[PDB]
mmCIF file with all atom_site columns, C-alpha atoms and ligand atoms in Angstrom:
data_model
loop_
_atom_site.group_PDB
_atom_site.id
_atom_site.type_symbol
_atom_site.label_atom_id
_atom_site.label_alt_id
_atom_site.label_comp_id
_atom_site.label_asym_id
_atom_site.label_entity_id
_atom_site.label_seq_id
_atom_site.pdbx_PDB_ins_code
_atom_site.Cartn_x
_atom_site.Cartn_y
_atom_site.Cartn_z
_atom_site.occupancy
_atom_site.B_iso_or_equiv
_atom_site.pdbx_formal_charge
_atom_site.auth_seq_id
_atom_site.auth_comp_id
_atom_site.auth_asym_id
_atom_site.auth_atom_id
_atom_site.pdbx_PDB_model_num
ATOM   1   C  CA  . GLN Z 1 1   ? -17.120 3.999   -2.158  1.00 25.02 ? 24  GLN Z CA  1
ATOM   2   C  CA  . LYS Z 1 2   ? -17.075 1.996   -5.470  1.00 24.70 ? 25  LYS Z CA  1
ATOM   3   C  CA  . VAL Z 1 3   ? -13.943 0.806   -7.394  1.00 23.09 ? 26  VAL Z CA  1
ATOM   4   C  CA  . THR Z 1 4   ? -14.107 -0.177  -11.131 1.00 22.62 ? 27  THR Z CA  1
ATOM   5   C  CA  . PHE Z 1 5   ? -12.207 -2.816  -13.191 1.00 23.22 ? 28  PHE Z CA  1
ATOM   6   C  CA  . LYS Z 1 6   ? -13.255 -2.920  -16.896 1.00 21.32 ? 29  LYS Z CA  1
ATOM   7   C  CA  . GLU Z 1 7   ? -16.951 -4.104  -16.753 1.00 23.05 ? 30  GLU Z CA  1
ATOM   8   C  CA  . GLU Z 1 8   ? -16.746 -4.949  -12.985 1.00 23.17 ? 31  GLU Z CA  1
ATOM   9   C  CA  . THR Z 1 9   ? -17.734 -2.648  -10.068 1.00 24.45 ? 32  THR Z CA  1
ATOM   10  C  CA  . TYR Z 1 10  ? -16.502 -3.500  -6.499  1.00 25.11 ? 33  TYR Z CA  1
ATOM   11  C  CA  . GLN Z 1 11  ? -17.902 -2.800  -3.036  1.00 25.74 ? 34  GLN Z CA  1
ATOM   12  C  CA  . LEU Z 1 12  ? -14.797 -2.345  -0.793  1.00 23.30 ? 35  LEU Z CA  1
ATOM   13  C  CA  . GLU Z 1 13  ? -14.767 -4.826  2.167   1.00 22.40 ? 36  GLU Z CA  1
ATOM   14  C  CA  . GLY Z 1 14  ? -13.353 -4.122  5.669   1.00 22.25 ? 37  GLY Z CA  1
ATOM   15  C  CA  . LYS Z 1 15  ? -13.756 -0.972  7.862   1.00 21.01 ? 38  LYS Z CA  1
ATOM   16  C  CA  . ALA Z 1 16  ? -13.770 2.517   6.193   1.00 20.54 ? 39  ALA Z CA  1
ATOM   17  C  CA  . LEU Z 1 17  ? -10.764 4.679   7.315   1.00 17.75 ? 40  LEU Z CA  1
ATOM   18  C  CA  . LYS Z 1 18  ? -10.968 8.549   7.160   1.00 19.48 ? 41  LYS Z CA  1
ATOM   19  C  CA  . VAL Z 1 19  ? -8.247  11.293  7.371   1.00 18.76 ? 42  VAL Z CA  1
ATOM   20  C  CA  . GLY Z 1 20  ? -7.777  11.998  11.145  1.00 21.39 ? 43  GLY Z CA  1
ATOM   21  C  CA  . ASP Z 1 21  ? -8.685  8.393   12.229  1.00 24.48 ? 44  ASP Z CA  1
ATOM   22  C  CA  . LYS Z 1 22  ? -5.992  6.319   14.031  1.00 25.26 ? 45  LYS Z CA  1
ATOM   23  C  CA  . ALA Z 1 23  ? -5.111  3.549   11.504  1.00 24.15 ? 46  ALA Z CA  1
ATOM   24  C  CA  . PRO Z 1 24  ? -4.768  0.213   13.389  1.00 26.19 ? 47  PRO Z CA  1
ATOM   25  C  CA  . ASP Z 1 25  ? -1.286  -1.417  13.469  1.00 25.63 ? 48  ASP Z CA  1
ATOM   26  C  CA  . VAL Z 1 26  ? -1.587  -4.690  11.442  1.00 23.96 ? 49  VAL Z CA  1
ATOM   27  C  CA  . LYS Z 1 27  ? 0.605   -7.856  11.046  1.00 21.45 ? 50  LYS Z CA  1
ATOM   28  C  CA  . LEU Z 1 28  ? 2.144   -8.413  7.544   1.00 23.27 ? 51  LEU Z CA  1
ATOM   29  C  CA  . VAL Z 1 29  ? 4.868   -10.797 6.215   1.00 23.87 ? 52  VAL Z CA  1
ATOM   30  C  CA  . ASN Z 1 30  ? 8.178   -9.504  4.700   1.00 22.58 ? 53  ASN Z CA  1
ATOM   31  C  CA  . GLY Z 1 31  ? 10.619  -11.002 2.125   1.00 21.58 ? 54  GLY Z CA  1
ATOM   32  C  CA  . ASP Z 1 32  ? 12.342  -13.002 4.955   1.00 22.29 ? 55  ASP Z CA  1
ATOM   33  C  CA  . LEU Z 1 33  ? 8.954   -14.636 5.988   1.00 22.97 ? 56  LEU Z CA  1
ATOM   34  C  CA  . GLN Z 1 34  ? 9.271   -12.541 9.207   1.00 22.00 ? 57  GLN Z CA  1
ATOM   35  C  CA  . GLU Z 1 35  ? 6.022   -11.079 10.705  1.00 20.35 ? 58  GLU Z CA  1
ATOM   36  C  CA  . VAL Z 1 36  ? 6.262   -7.236  10.908  1.00 23.31 ? 59  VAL Z CA  1
ATOM   37  C  CA  . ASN Z 1 37  ? 3.929   -4.473  12.214  1.00 22.98 ? 60  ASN Z CA  1
ATOM   38  C  CA  . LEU Z 1 38  ? 2.901   -2.057  9.378   1.00 22.48 ? 61  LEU Z CA  1
ATOM   39  C  CA  . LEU Z 1 39  ? 3.582   1.100   11.508  1.00 24.35 ? 62  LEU Z CA  1
ATOM   40  C  CA  . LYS Z 1 40  ? 7.342   1.895   11.755  1.00 25.39 ? 63  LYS Z CA  1
ATOM   41  C  CA  . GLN Z 1 41  ? 8.391   2.984   15.308  1.00 25.16 ? 64  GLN Z CA  1
ATOM   42  C  CA  . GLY Z 1 42  ? 9.051   6.784   15.337  1.00 25.33 ? 65  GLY Z CA  1
ATOM   43  C  CA  . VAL Z 1 43  ? 8.780   7.642   11.567  1.00 24.34 ? 66  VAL Z CA  1
ATOM   44  C  CA  . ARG Z 1 44  ? 6.797   10.929  11.101  1.00 28.81 ? 67  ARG Z CA  1
ATOM   45  C  CA  . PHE Z 1 45  ? 5.527   10.304  7.490   1.00 31.16 ? 68  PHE Z CA  1
ATOM   46  C  CA  . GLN Z 1 46  ? 4.603   6.633   6.690   1.00 30.01 ? 69  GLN Z CA  1
ATOM   47  C  CA  . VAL Z 1 47  ? 3.540   6.113   3.013   1.00 29.63 ? 70  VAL Z CA  1
ATOM   48  C  CA  . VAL Z 1 48  ? 1.517   2.842   2.609   1.00 32.42 ? 71  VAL Z CA  1
ATOM   49  C  CA  . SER Z 1 49  ? 0.727   1.912   -1.048  1.00 32.57 ? 72  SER Z CA  1
ATOM   50  C  CA  . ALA Z 1 50  ? -1.539  -1.144  -1.706  1.00 32.65 ? 73  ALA Z CA  1
ATOM   51  C  CA  . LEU Z 1 51  ? -1.804  -2.925  -5.123  1.00 31.47 ? 74  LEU Z CA  1
ATOM   52  C  CA  . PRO Z 1 52  ? -4.081  -5.755  -6.360  1.00 34.16 ? 75  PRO Z CA  1
ATOM   53  C  CA  . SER Z 1 53  ? -0.921  -7.388  -7.913  1.00 34.96 ? 76  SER Z CA  1
ATOM   54  C  CA  . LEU Z 1 54  ? 2.815   -6.422  -7.865  1.00 35.93 ? 77  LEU Z CA  1
ATOM   55  C  CA  . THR Z 1 55  ? 3.354   -8.345  -11.192 1.00 35.65 ? 78  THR Z CA  1
ATOM   56  C  CA  . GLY Z 1 56  ? 4.142   -5.763  -13.950 1.00 35.14 ? 79  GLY Z CA  1
ATOM   57  C  CA  . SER Z 1 57  ? 2.564   -2.941  -11.865 1.00 36.62 ? 80  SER Z CA  1
ATOM   58  C  CA  . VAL Z 1 58  ? 3.379   0.782   -12.493 1.00 36.32 ? 81  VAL Z CA  1
ATOM   59  C  CA  . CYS Z 1 59  ? 4.192   1.185   -8.762  1.00 39.46 ? 82  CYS Z CA  1
ATOM   60  C  CA  . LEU Z 1 60  ? 6.884   -1.544  -8.967  1.00 41.45 ? 83  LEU Z CA  1
ATOM   61  C  CA  . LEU Z 1 61  ? 8.595   0.304   -11.893 1.00 41.01 ? 84  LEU Z CA  1
ATOM   62  C  CA  . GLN Z 1 62  ? 8.772   3.656   -9.972  1.00 40.27 ? 85  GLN Z CA  1
ATOM   63  C  CA  . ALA Z 1 63  ? 9.308   1.963   -6.547  1.00 42.66 ? 86  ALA Z CA  1
ATOM   64  C  CA  . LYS Z 1 64  ? 13.178  2.085   -6.687  1.00 44.14 ? 87  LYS Z CA  1
ATOM   65  C  CA  . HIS Z 1 65  ? 13.170  5.888   -7.496  1.00 45.43 ? 88  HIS Z CA  1
ATOM   66  C  CA  . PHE Z 1 66  ? 10.389  6.919   -4.999  1.00 41.97 ? 89  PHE Z CA  1
ATOM   67  C  CA  . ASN Z 1 67  ? 12.070  4.802   -2.214  1.00 41.34 ? 90  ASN Z CA  1
ATOM   68  C  CA  . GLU Z 1 68  ? 15.378  6.738   -2.818  1.00 40.92 ? 91  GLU Z CA  1
ATOM   69  C  CA  . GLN Z 1 69  ? 13.722  10.231  -2.712  1.00 39.53 ? 92  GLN Z CA  1
ATOM   70  C  CA  . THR Z 1 70  ? 11.670  9.277   0.441   1.00 40.44 ? 93  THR Z CA  1
ATOM   71  C  CA  . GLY Z 1 71  ? 14.751  7.675   2.138   1.00 40.57 ? 94  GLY Z CA  1
ATOM   72  C  CA  . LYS Z 1 72  ? 16.725  10.979  1.842   1.00 40.77 ? 95  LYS Z CA  1
ATOM   73  C  CA  . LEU Z 1 73  ? 13.709  12.937  3.303   1.00 35.22 ? 96  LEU Z CA  1
ATOM   74  C  CA  . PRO Z 1 74  ? 13.655  13.128  7.158   1.00 34.78 ? 97  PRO Z CA  1
ATOM   75  C  CA  . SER Z 1 75  ? 11.391  10.561  8.930   1.00 28.65 ? 98  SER Z CA  1
ATOM   76  C  CA  . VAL Z 1 76  ? 9.588   9.363   5.710   1.00 30.80 ? 99  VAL Z CA  1
ATOM   77  C  CA  . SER Z 1 77  ? 9.054   5.558   5.247   1.00 31.14 ? 100 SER Z CA  1
ATOM   78  C  CA  . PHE Z 1 78  ? 7.652   3.795   2.110   1.00 29.49 ? 101 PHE Z CA  1
ATOM   79  C  CA  . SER Z 1 79  ? 5.786   0.419   2.347   1.00 29.85 ? 102 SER Z CA  1
ATOM   80  C  CA  . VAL Z 1 80  ? 4.228   -1.490  -0.627  1.00 28.07 ? 103 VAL Z CA  1
ATOM   81  C  CA  . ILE Z 1 81  ? 1.496   -4.066  0.249   1.00 32.26 ? 104 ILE Z CA  1
ATOM   82  C  CA  . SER Z 1 82  ? -0.098  -6.842  -1.895  1.00 32.14 ? 105 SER Z CA  1
ATOM   83  C  CA  . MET Z 1 83  ? -1.739  -10.288 -1.507  1.00 29.72 ? 106 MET Z CA  1
ATOM   84  C  CA  . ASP Z 1 84  ? 1.298   -11.647 -3.478  1.00 30.73 ? 107 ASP Z CA  1
ATOM   85  C  CA  . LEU Z 1 85  ? 3.373   -14.181 -1.493  1.00 32.72 ? 108 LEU Z CA  1
ATOM   86  C  CA  . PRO Z 1 86  ? 6.763   -12.769 -0.334  1.00 29.44 ? 109 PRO Z CA  1
ATOM   87  C  CA  . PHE Z 1 87  ? 8.709   -15.225 -2.635  1.00 29.58 ? 110 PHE Z CA  1
ATOM   88  C  CA  . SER Z 1 88  ? 6.956   -13.840 -5.787  1.00 28.17 ? 111 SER Z CA  1
ATOM   89  C  CA  . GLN Z 1 89  ? 7.280   -10.248 -4.367  1.00 31.62 ? 112 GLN Z CA  1
ATOM   90  C  CA  . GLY Z 1 90  ? 11.047  -10.834 -3.758  1.00 28.21 ? 113 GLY Z CA  1
ATOM   91  C  CA  . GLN Z 1 91  ? 11.618  -12.207 -7.317  1.00 26.27 ? 114 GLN Z CA  1
ATOM   92  C  CA  . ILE Z 1 92  ? 9.372   -9.535  -9.040  1.00 25.60 ? 115 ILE Z CA  1
ATOM   93  C  CA  . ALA Z 1 93  ? 11.175  -6.748  -7.052  1.00 23.85 ? 116 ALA Z CA  1
ATOM   94  C  CA  . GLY Z 1 94  ? 14.671  -8.344  -7.460  1.00 24.54 ? 117 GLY Z CA  1
ATOM   95  C  CA  . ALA Z 1 95  ? 14.042  -8.700  -11.253 1.00 22.12 ? 118 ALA Z CA  1
ATOM   96  C  CA  . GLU Z 1 96  ? 13.307  -4.915  -11.522 1.00 20.17 ? 119 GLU Z CA  1
ATOM   97  C  CA  . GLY Z 1 97  ? 16.501  -4.061  -9.590  1.00 20.37 ? 120 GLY Z CA  1
ATOM   98  C  CA  . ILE Z 1 98  ? 14.745  -2.730  -6.453  1.00 17.86 ? 121 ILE Z CA  1
ATOM   99  C  CA  . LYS Z 1 99  ? 16.921  -3.329  -3.373  1.00 16.66 ? 122 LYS Z CA  1
ATOM   100 C  CA  . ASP Z 1 100 ? 15.853  -2.738  0.287   1.00 15.69 ? 123 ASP Z CA  1
ATOM   101 C  CA  . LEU Z 1 101 ? 12.224  -1.836  -0.525  1.00 15.35 ? 124 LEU Z CA  1
ATOM   102 C  CA  . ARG Z 1 102 ? 9.706   -2.540  2.306   1.00 17.91 ? 125 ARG Z CA  1
ATOM   103 C  CA  . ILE Z 1 103 ? 7.386   -4.796  0.192   1.00 15.85 ? 126 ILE Z CA  1
ATOM   104 C  CA  . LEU Z 1 104 ? 4.995   -6.680  2.547   1.00 13.33 ? 127 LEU Z CA  1
ATOM   105 C  CA  . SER Z 1 105 ? 2.384   -9.432  1.947   1.00 14.36 ? 128 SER Z CA  1
ATOM   106 C  CA  . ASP Z 1 106 ? -1.157  -9.379  3.465   1.00 13.90 ? 129 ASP Z CA  1
ATOM   107 C  CA  . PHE Z 1 107 ? -1.683  -13.080 2.485   1.00 16.41 ? 130 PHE Z CA  1
ATOM   108 C  CA  . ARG Z 1 108 ? -1.511  -14.579 6.051   1.00 15.54 ? 131 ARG Z CA  1
ATOM   109 C  CA  . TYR Z 1 109 ? -4.217  -12.552 7.945   1.00 13.24 ? 132 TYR Z CA  1
ATOM   110 C  CA  . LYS Z 1 110 ? -5.689  -10.148 5.318   1.00 12.92 ? 133 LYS Z CA  1
ATOM   111 C  CA  . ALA Z 1 111 ? -5.305  -7.708  8.266   1.00 15.07 ? 134 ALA Z CA  1
ATOM   112 C  CA  . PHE Z 1 112 ? -4.374  -4.651  6.080   1.00 15.50 ? 135 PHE Z CA  1
ATOM   113 C  CA  . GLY Z 1 113 ? -7.245  -5.267  3.590   1.00 16.00 ? 136 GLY Z CA  1
ATOM   114 C  CA  . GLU Z 1 114 ? -9.826  -5.775  6.417   1.00 16.43 ? 137 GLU Z CA  1
ATOM   115 C  CA  . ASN Z 1 115 ? -8.655  -2.873  8.694   1.00 18.28 ? 138 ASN Z CA  1
ATOM   116 C  CA  . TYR Z 1 116 ? -7.952  -0.204  5.955   1.00 15.35 ? 139 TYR Z CA  1
ATOM   117 C  CA  . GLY Z 1 117 ? -11.190 -1.062  4.037   1.00 16.45 ? 140 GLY Z CA  1
ATOM   118 C  CA  . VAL Z 1 118 ? -9.485  -1.980  0.675   1.00 15.68 ? 141 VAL Z CA  1
ATOM   119 C  CA  . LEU Z 1 119 ? -10.269 -5.770  0.452   1.00 16.77 ? 142 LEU Z CA  1
ATOM   120 C  CA  . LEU Z 1 120 ? -12.131 -6.160  -2.909  1.00 15.97 ? 143 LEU Z CA  1
ATOM   121 C  CA  . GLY Z 1 121 ? -15.457 -8.063  -2.604  1.00 12.60 ? 144 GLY Z CA  1
ATOM   122 C  CA  . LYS Z 1 122 ? -17.314 -10.392 -5.060  1.00 9.75  ? 145 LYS Z CA  1
ATOM   123 C  CA  . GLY Z 1 123 ? -15.828 -10.347 -8.621  1.00 11.61 ? 146 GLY Z CA  1
ATOM   124 C  CA  . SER Z 1 124 ? -12.734 -11.539 -10.596 1.00 12.95 ? 147 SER Z CA  1
ATOM   125 C  CA  . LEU Z 1 125 ? -10.385 -9.592  -8.185  1.00 13.16 ? 148 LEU Z CA  1
ATOM   126 C  CA  . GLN Z 1 126 ? -12.201 -10.746 -4.963  1.00 11.98 ? 149 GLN Z CA  1
ATOM   127 C  CA  . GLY Z 1 127 ? -9.757  -10.990 -1.990  1.00 13.61 ? 150 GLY Z CA  1
ATOM   128 C  CA  . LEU Z 1 128 ? -7.132  -8.707  -3.679  1.00 15.21 ? 151 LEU Z CA  1
ATOM   129 C  CA  . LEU Z 1 129 ? -6.336  -5.157  -2.387  1.00 16.46 ? 152 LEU Z CA  1
ATOM   130 C  CA  . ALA Z 1 130 ? -7.832  -2.042  -4.090  1.00 15.60 ? 153 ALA Z CA  1
ATOM   131 C  CA  . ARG Z 1 131 ? -5.208  0.354   -5.576  1.00 13.19 ? 154 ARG Z CA  1
ATOM   132 C  CA  . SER Z 1 132 ? -4.781  2.809   -2.647  1.00 13.64 ? 155 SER Z CA  1
ATOM   133 C  CA  . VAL Z 1 133 ? -2.236  5.009   -0.814  1.00 14.10 ? 156 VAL Z CA  1
ATOM   134 C  CA  . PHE Z 1 134 ? -2.257  6.174   2.841   1.00 9.63  ? 157 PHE Z CA  1
ATOM   135 C  CA  . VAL Z 1 135 ? 0.124   8.536   4.667   1.00 7.56  ? 158 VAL Z CA  1
ATOM   136 C  CA  . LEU Z 1 136 ? 0.208   7.848   8.451   1.00 7.10  ? 159 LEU Z CA  1
ATOM   137 C  CA  . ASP Z 1 137 ? 2.022   9.919   11.138  1.00 7.19  ? 160 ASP Z CA  1
ATOM   138 C  CA  . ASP Z 1 138 ? 4.172   8.320   13.933  1.00 6.50  ? 161 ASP Z CA  1
ATOM   139 C  CA  . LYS Z 1 139 ? 0.922   7.875   16.014  1.00 9.23  ? 162 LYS Z CA  1
ATOM   140 C  CA  . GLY Z 1 140 ? -0.740  5.877   13.146  1.00 11.80 ? 163 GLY Z CA  1
ATOM   141 C  CA  . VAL Z 1 141 ? -3.266  8.716   12.442  1.00 12.61 ? 164 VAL Z CA  1
ATOM   142 C  CA  . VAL Z 1 142 ? -4.235  9.025   8.721   1.00 9.95  ? 165 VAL Z CA  1
ATOM   143 C  CA  . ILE Z 1 143 ? -2.658  12.249  7.302   1.00 10.82 ? 166 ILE Z CA  1
ATOM   144 C  CA  . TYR Z 1 144 ? -3.768  11.437  3.694   1.00 9.50  ? 167 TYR Z CA  1
ATOM   145 C  CA  . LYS Z 1 145 ? -5.975  8.704   2.107   1.00 11.93 ? 168 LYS Z CA  1
ATOM   146 C  CA  . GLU Z 1 146 ? -6.589  8.004   -1.620  1.00 14.70 ? 169 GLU Z CA  1
ATOM   147 C  CA  . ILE Z 1 147 ? -8.424  4.971   -3.101  1.00 13.88 ? 170 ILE Z CA  1
ATOM   148 C  CA  . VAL Z 1 148 ? -8.156  5.037   -6.941  1.00 10.99 ? 171 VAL Z CA  1
ATOM   149 C  CA  . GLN Z 1 149 ? -11.643 4.872   -8.564  1.00 12.53 ? 172 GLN Z CA  1
ATOM   150 C  CA  . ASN Z 1 150 ? -10.216 2.821   -11.532 1.00 12.54 ? 173 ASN Z CA  1
ATOM   151 C  CA  . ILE Z 1 151 ? -8.137  -0.109  -10.119 1.00 12.57 ? 174 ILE Z CA  1
ATOM   152 C  CA  . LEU Z 1 152 ? -5.864  -0.018  -13.267 1.00 14.88 ? 175 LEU Z CA  1
ATOM   153 C  CA  . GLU Z 1 153 ? -4.873  3.674   -12.697 1.00 16.83 ? 176 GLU Z CA  1
ATOM   154 C  CA  . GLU Z 1 154 ? -2.189  5.147   -10.350 1.00 16.05 ? 177 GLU Z CA  1
ATOM   155 C  CA  . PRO Z 1 155 ? -2.844  7.375   -7.285  1.00 13.67 ? 178 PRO Z CA  1
ATOM   156 C  CA  . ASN Z 1 156 ? -2.588  11.217  -7.651  1.00 9.27  ? 179 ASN Z CA  1
ATOM   157 C  CA  . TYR Z 1 157 ? 1.221   11.813  -7.702  1.00 10.36 ? 180 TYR Z CA  1
ATOM   158 C  CA  . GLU Z 1 158 ? 1.002   15.612  -7.194  1.00 7.38  ? 181 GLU Z CA  1
ATOM   159 C  CA  . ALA Z 1 159 ? -1.285  15.244  -4.098  1.00 5.82  ? 182 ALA Z CA  1
ATOM   160 C  CA  . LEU Z 1 160 ? 0.981   12.565  -2.518  1.00 4.07  ? 183 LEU Z CA  1
ATOM   161 C  CA  . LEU Z 1 161 ? 4.238   14.601  -2.987  1.00 8.18  ? 184 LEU Z CA  1
ATOM   162 C  CA  . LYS Z 1 162 ? 2.532   17.804  -1.633  1.00 6.34  ? 185 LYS Z CA  1
ATOM   163 C  CA  . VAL Z 1 163 ? 1.741   15.937  1.683   1.00 8.58  ? 186 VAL Z CA  1
ATOM   164 C  CA  . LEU Z 1 164 ? 5.516   15.065  2.014   1.00 6.50  ? 187 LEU Z CA  1
ATOM   165 C  CA  . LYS Z 1 165 ? 6.481   18.809  1.754   1.00 9.36  ? 188 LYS Z CA  1
HETATM 166 C  C1  . LIG R 2 .   ? 3.959   2.674   -5.728  1.00 12.92 ? 1   LIG R C1  1
HETATM 167 N  N1  . LIG R 2 .   ? 2.811   3.227   -5.379  1.00 12.92 ? 1   LIG R N1  1
HETATM 168 C  C2  . LIG R 2 .   ? 3.065   4.524   -5.257  1.00 12.92 ? 1   LIG R C2  1
HETATM 169 C  C3  . LIG R 2 .   ? 2.030   5.564   -4.845  1.00 12.92 ? 1   LIG R C3  1
HETATM 170 N  N2  . LIG R 2 .   ? 4.330   4.783   -5.561  1.00 12.92 ? 1   LIG R N2  1
HETATM 171 C  C4  . LIG R 2 .   ? 4.959   6.126   -5.547  1.00 12.92 ? 1   LIG R C4  1
HETATM 172 C  C5  . LIG R 2 .   ? 4.859   6.820   -6.904  1.00 12.92 ? 1   LIG R C5  1
HETATM 173 O  O1  . LIG R 2 .   ? 5.541   6.069   -7.904  1.00 12.92 ? 1   LIG R O1  1
HETATM 174 C  C6  . LIG R 2 .   ? 4.885   3.615   -5.864  1.00 12.92 ? 1   LIG R C6  1
HETATM 175 N  N3  . LIG R 2 .   ? 6.156   3.504   -6.219  1.00 12.92 ? 1   LIG R N3  1
HETATM 176 NA NA1 . NA  R 3 .   ? -2.511  10.186  -4.117  1.00 10.83 ? 2   NA  R NA1 1
#
């Protein structure tokens, strides 16, 4: 699978993950510099959205709304991952008026990038995460997987919402 950024084309680094595969539980760092496991204990629908950069991203703007709608749904969690440090993530998020959003950094181990196969290879965005969304069940099996072909574009909104019906 190839991802594009203006005149650049990326080979995705890490292990390829398919619908039906058990996604591995990975270590990430939260806004309190606490190490957390990606997979929430018991939650039936786990949305995991990965961004190259939180800074001025479309996902950050709609994060507060989507987090509300998912929160009210039964057993649906919403996690946003980037290579951004937690401090920057906390201030970016805080500045947009997004409270209690599970924004997590992959900076320490690059465990999400490597295990979900979305670590961008050689190029200007090398070592950043490809724009991607996963839905995992309580068991960590991949219900839905989308990796955007154009890193600047957003995942299919329709297709994501339909999975949460
Ligand atoms: C970030 N990434 C995704 C897929 N979302 C949900 C739609 O806005 C956000 N907020
Ligand atoms: Na999608």
